[PDB]
Design an enzyme around this catalytic site. Structure first.
Site, PDB file in Angstrom:
ATOM      1  N   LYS A 102       0.842  -1.186   0.000  1.00 30.46           N
ATOM      2  CA  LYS A 102       0.000   0.000   0.000  1.00 30.46           C
ATOM      3  C   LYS A 102       0.878   1.236   0.000  1.00 30.46           C
ATOM      4  O   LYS A 102       1.931   1.265   0.635  1.00 30.46           O
ATOM      5  CB  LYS A 102      -0.936   0.030   1.205  1.00 30.46           C
ATOM      6  CG  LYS A 102      -2.236   0.730   0.940  1.00 30.46           C
ATOM      7  CD  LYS A 102      -3.161  -0.160   0.169  1.00 30.46           C
ATOM      8  CE  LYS A 102      -4.318   0.628  -0.365  1.00 30.46           C
ATOM      9  NZ  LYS A 102      -5.398  -0.254  -0.862  1.00 30.46           N
ATOM     10  N   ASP A 142      -6.229   3.959  -6.386  1.00 32.62           N
ATOM     11  CA  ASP A 142      -7.025   3.903  -5.170  1.00 32.62           C
ATOM     12  C   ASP A 142      -7.747   5.221  -4.945  1.00 32.62           C
ATOM     13  O   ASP A 142      -7.967   5.976  -5.894  1.00 32.62           O
ATOM     14  CB  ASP A 142      -6.167   3.549  -3.962  1.00 32.62           C
ATOM     15  CG  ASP A 142      -6.936   2.769  -2.929  1.00 32.62           C
ATOM     16  OD1 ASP A 142      -8.177   2.714  -3.031  1.00 32.62           O
ATOM     17  OD2 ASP A 142      -6.308   2.206  -2.017  1.00 32.62           O
ATOM     18  N   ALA A 220     -18.654   1.328  -7.944  1.00 28.58           N
ATOM     19  CA  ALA A 220     -18.871   0.006  -7.368  1.00 28.58           C
ATOM     20  C   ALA A 220     -20.354  -0.288  -7.198  1.00 28.58           C
ATOM     21  O   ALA A 220     -20.851  -1.310  -7.678  1.00 28.58           O
ATOM     22  CB  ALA A 220     -18.143  -0.107  -6.031  1.00 28.58           C
ATOM     23  N   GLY A 221     -21.085   0.611  -6.539  1.00 24.78           N
ATOM     24  CA  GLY A 221     -22.500   0.365  -6.304  1.00 24.78           C
ATOM     25  C   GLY A 221     -23.325   0.372  -7.576  1.00 24.78           C
ATOM     26  O   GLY A 221     -24.181  -0.496  -7.785  1.00 24.78           O
TER      27      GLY A 221
HETATM   28  N1  LIG Z   1     -13.193   1.618  -1.772  1.00 22.23           N
HETATM   29  C1  LIG Z   1     -14.485   1.210  -2.310  1.00 22.23           C
HETATM   30  C2  LIG Z   1     -14.622  -0.314  -2.277  1.00 22.23           C
HETATM   31  C3  LIG Z   1     -13.302  -1.052  -2.137  1.00 22.23           C
HETATM   32  C4  LIG Z   1     -12.465  -0.992  -3.400  1.00 22.23           C
HETATM   33  O1  LIG Z   1     -12.789  -0.180  -4.290  1.00 22.23           O
HETATM   34  O2  LIG Z   1     -11.483  -1.757  -3.501  1.00 22.23           O
HETATM   35  C5  LIG Z   1     -15.631   1.856  -1.540  1.00 22.23           C
HETATM   36  O3  LIG Z   1     -15.421   2.247  -0.393  1.00 22.23           O
HETATM   37  O4  LIG Z   1     -16.724   1.963  -2.095  1.00 22.23           O
END
Ligand SMILES: N[C@@H](CCC(=O)O)C(=O)O
Ligand SMILES: NC(=O)c1ccc[n+]([C@@H]2O[C@H](COP(=O)([O-])OP(=O)(O)OC[C@H]3O[C@@H](n4cnc5c(N)ncnc54)[C@H](OP(=O)(O)O)[C@@H]3O)[C@@H](O)[C@H]2O)c1
Length: 416
Positions: A102, A142, A220-221
């Protein structure tokens, strides 16, 4: 409450459930290398500002370390160490030839221009060059870093390296024009969808036609809801953002909701939909609930109210251990966070393989390989869950730590 102390406590609670020597546990409780560097860049006004950058390599018994770079004003060394520790178990549970890593820079990138951002990326690479490489440490995007910064970092690394090897493979999440990989934008959601499908198969449920509620509507969602609707055939009844939630029993179309959110900055007040908030959104009568937003959202205060048969923790640690308990005795199959969202790092591994080999795959090949990886990982975790009669998060910790411990013993690092 220190992030690193929480990670160490979770590792110890895990080691309670498996046969691991105390010397190996002491080894796993400490990052194997921490690098803190000064990152000087020239500002647009001509002055020179120095930032603090980190690069933590928790463990590399299984292979080169892997982990993203965060650009956050609230970044600390302890947060980076905890995230590297989690990255170790994340790559171990999904069986990648990787360790945990990281990085981060304590910076507010929203107040940096594009030129200053490029200077920051190049200066970070110039500062941490001596500990990274295609076979040493592979960074990735990230929080507040994106493929554009990844391309800048790759270019600077290639400049320093003098093109003596696979400089494309030093960093993943790159644009497709320079060593990027197909299927990387929807990696995490695809992995979560595969885990949800396997969980439903384990529970004896055919997901075609049932309800899914998603919290958090970022990449993501949103992609979780979309791929659920198409691949799993489920009905998306509720979504929410950093403002509020929208609920419709008949089902929401993720594309239209994304258009709404882009146009007005929030998903609230969507046509033909009841406006709600996150707290009451967490307990809709749905088959699958997928928290994909900020950490610590399910707690003992509302853990009992949760009614989802399957909970897929896309986000990092949305559920507290106590809520893990109540959810277990309630009869609900939880997919652990670092097993559910391991698709992103798996597709990063695929990109690294393509870069190292010089040969690039298609969308179908990436998709099929990701499917096999995620299915196998879920089934190993679930079989440990059954055999050891432990919580499934503890099973994920057992699988990952067992793999890392075996690798450590094979190298002879720990003699017991
Ligand atoms: N960091 C993303 C999910 C984890 C990732 O993207 O690896 C979030 O909090 O929605
Ligand atoms: O990478 P990535 O795409 O997965 O990360 P990401 O793009 O930052 O995803 C963040 C998502 O979670 C939401 N979010 C952040 N804090 C929240 C909170 N306290 N409560 C509810 N939702 C929250 C964000 O809402 P917003 O986008 O509305 O801020 C966004 O929908």
């Amino acid at each position: 409450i220190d992030p690193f102390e929480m990670a160490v406590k979770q590792l110890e609670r895990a080691a309670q459930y498996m046969d691991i020597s105390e010397e190996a546990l002491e080894w796993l409780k400490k990052p194997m290398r921490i690098v803190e560097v000064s990152v000087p860049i020239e500002m647009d006004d001509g002055s020179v500002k120095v930032f603090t950058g980190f690069r933590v390599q928790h463990n590399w018994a299984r292979g080169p370390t892997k982990g993203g770079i965060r650009w956050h004003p609230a970044e600390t060394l302890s947060t980076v160490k905890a995230l590297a520790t989690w990255m170790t178990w994340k790559v171990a549970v999904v069986d990648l030839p990787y360790g945990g890593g990281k990085g981060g820079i304590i910076v507010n990138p929203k107040e940096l221009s594009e030129r200053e951002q490029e200077r920051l990326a190049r200066a970070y690479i110039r500062a941490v060059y001596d500990v990274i490489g295609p076979w040493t440490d592979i960074p990735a995007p990230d929080v507040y870093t994106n493929p554009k910064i990844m391309g800048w970092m790759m270019d600077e690394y290639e400049t320093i390296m003098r093109r003596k090897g696979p400089a494309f493979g030093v960093i993943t999440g790159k644009p497709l024009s320079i060593g990027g990989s197909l299927g990387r934008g929807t990696a995490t959601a695809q992995g979560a969808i595969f885990t949800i499908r396997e969980a439903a198969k384990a529970l004896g449920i055919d997901l075609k036609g049932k309800k899914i509620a998603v919290q958090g509507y970022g990449n993501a969602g949103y992609y979780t809801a979309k791929l659920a609707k198409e691949q799993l055939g489920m009905t998306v009844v509720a979504v929410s953002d950093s403002r509020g939630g929208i609920y419709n029993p008949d089902g929401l179309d993720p594309d239209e909701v994304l258009k709404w959110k882009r146009e007005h900055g929030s998903v609230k007040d969507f046509p033909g939909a009841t406006n709600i908030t996150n707290e009451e959104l967490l307990e809709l009568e749905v088959d699958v609930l997928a928290p994909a937003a900020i950490e610590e959202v399910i707690t003992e205060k509302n853990a009992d109210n949760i009614k989802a048969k399957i909970v897929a923790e896309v986000a990092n640690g949305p559920v507290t251990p106590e809520a893990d308990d109540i959810l277990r005795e309630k009869g609900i199959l939880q997919i652990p966070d670092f097993l559910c969202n391991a698709g992103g790092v798996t597709v990063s591994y695929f990109e690294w393989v393509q870069n190292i080999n010089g040969y690039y795959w298609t969308e179908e090949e990436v998709r099929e390989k990701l499917d096999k990886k995620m299915t196998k990982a879920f089934w190993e975790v679930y079989n440990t869950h059954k055999d050891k009669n432990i919580h499934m998060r503890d099973a994920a910790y057992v699988v990952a730590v067992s793999r890392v411990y075996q690798a450590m013993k094979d190298r002879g690092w720990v003699k017991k």
